[PDB]
Structure 1
Amino acid sequence: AETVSFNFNSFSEGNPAINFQGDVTVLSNGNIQLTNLNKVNSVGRVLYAMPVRIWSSATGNVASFLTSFSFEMKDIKDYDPADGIIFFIAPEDTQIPAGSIGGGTLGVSDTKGAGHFVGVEFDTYSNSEYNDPPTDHVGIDVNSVDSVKTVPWNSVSGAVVKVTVIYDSSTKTLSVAVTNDNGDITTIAQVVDLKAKLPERVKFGFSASGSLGGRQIHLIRSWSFTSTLITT
């Protein structure tokens, strides 16, 4: 089988295994801080450098994957804690949208909220223009921030959140298990057929954004990943 696996316990600048796009900045403690607090409509994304081949056109096979990661959102004085983080999968040629307004677009879509990606968001601001739930929420997105499905959640400031995601090639199910600092778990699942939504090779990464009045610290702390494609 064809397996891809990596494990970051801390990050550093100048590491060929990662692509930094936009306002991303590596902190002295090894954390990745996605957006710049002093910039309007700041967008910062981090991608794993090597493109992963999630499905084969010759075998028609799709990959299964297990990935776990932890992040932290923290309030800054005077600004609204917005907009949130998003773990996504997108074509290898993926780039931050031209003229991106950041904000509720999460750094991955256009003004209408359309884009070419699939991912799980942790939304801390309800954008009525994208049909956001009235509360913080975790969501599954397929080519749009107007979530296919969402589950009510609570973003605690300065709280380390651990997430685990499982994609099963057979059922084409994408499972997510979020563990809040207080101990409670929030799970959400949905059948998304990657073979039909994304090309053969893609790139995994995280993104975050802010607006003029919406800014908060968005931190990625660790990230392990393992995918396996049946080659036969």
Structure 2
Amino acid sequence: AETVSFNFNSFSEGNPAINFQGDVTVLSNGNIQLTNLNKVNSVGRVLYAMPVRIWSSATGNVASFLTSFSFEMKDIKDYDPADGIIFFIAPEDTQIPAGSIGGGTLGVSDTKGAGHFVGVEFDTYSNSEYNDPPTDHVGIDVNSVDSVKTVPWNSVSGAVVKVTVIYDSSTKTLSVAVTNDNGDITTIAQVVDLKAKLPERVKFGFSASGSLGGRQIHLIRSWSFTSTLITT
């Protein structure tokens, strides 16, 4: 069994174990701030440096994984609280899309909302061009910010949010459990064939974006992960 596991209680910009893309910055409190509040169409992303093998071309096996993280989004004067954070998986050579307009692309897709990735978004603005639901929501994305599925949710400014994600390889099911401020949990699950959508090796990470008038603080506070690929 090939296992990749790690844990971040805090981040240090000088740690090579993580790739910093775009406007991402690391605060003195150890938090990763994904976007630059003072830039138009800002986009920042963070990736665990080591690529993870999610499936074997020899056995045909797909890995299962369990990951938990905590983020925080907070409103800022005088901008519309947008656009949200997305936890994504993508080719190891993934980079912020060329000429990215940020905003509703969440830093992972082109203007049409397409890209090569699988993710769980925590969307705080309704983009009609991507068929977003009317309210804040958590969504399961497969190569598009036009979610395969979404569930109503509520982004509380200044609130620390906990998320737990389980990917069961046999059923190809991706399950998400979000722990809100008011105490309630929000869940969403969807069958996504990682082996059919992503290459053998991939990088896991977070991305957030903003536009001209849409901006807010996007912070990653902690992140634990364990993936196990059966090789027997």
Q: What TM-score, normalized by structure 2, do the two folds share?
A: 1.00
Residue-pair matches, total = 232
Q: Distance in 2 between matches of 1:114 and 1:127?
A: 14
State the 1:86 CA deviation: 0.1
Q: Distance in 2 between matches of 1:163 and 1:97?
A: 26
State the 1:52 CA deviation: 0.2
State the 1:167 CA deviation: 0.2
State the 1:14 CA deviation: 1.3
State the 1:93 CA deviation: 0.6
Q: Distance in 1 between matches of 2:196 and 2:79?
A: 40
State the 1:182 CA deviation: 1.2
Query: For each residue in 1:151-200, what CA deviation from the matched residue of structure 2 results, as whole angstroms up to 9, or x when unmatched?
Result: 00000000000000000010000000000011100000000000000000
Query: For each residue in 1:68-91, what CA deviation from the matched residue of structure 2 results, as whole angstroms up to 9, or x when unmatched?
Result: 000000000010000000000000
Q: Distance in 1 between matches of 2:76 and 2:181?
A: 20
Q: Secondary structure at the match of 2:12?
A: coil
Unaligned runs of 5+ in 2: none
Match of residue 81 from structure 1: 81
Q: Secondary structure at the match of 1:196?
A: helix
Q: Secondary structure at the match of 2:211?
A: coil
Match of residue 124 from structure 2: 124
State the 1:13 CA deviation: 1.2
Query: For each residue in 1:93-128, what CA deviation from the matched residue of structure 2 results, as whole angstroms up to 9, or x when unmatched?
Result: 100000000000000000000000000000000000
Q: Distance in 1 between matches of 2:59 and 2:14?
A: 37
Q: Secondary structure at the match of 1:120?
A: strand
Q: Secondary structure at the match of 1:16?
A: coil
Q: Distance in 1 between matches of 2:181 and 2:134?
A: 22
State the 1:18 CA deviation: 0.2
Match of residue 216 from structure 2: 216
Q: Distance in 2 between matches of 1:141 and 1:181?
A: 24
State the 1:16 CA deviation: 1.4
Unaligned runs of 5+ in 1: none
Q: Distance in 2 between matches of 1:225 and 1:62?
A: 16
Q: Secondary structure at the match of 1:50?
A: coil
Q: Distance in 2 between matches of 1:228 and 1:153?
A: 30
Q: Secondary structure at the match of 1:85?
A: strand
Q: Distance in 1 between matches of 2:159 and 2:220?
A: 12
Q: Secondary structure at the match of 2:219?
A: strand
Q: Secondary structure at the match of 1:96?
A: coil
Match of residue 108 from structure 2: 108
Q: Secondary structure at the match of 1:129?
A: helix
Q: What TM-score, normalized by structure 1, do the two folds share?
A: 1.00
Q: Distance in 1 between matches of 2:78 and 2:172?
A: 43
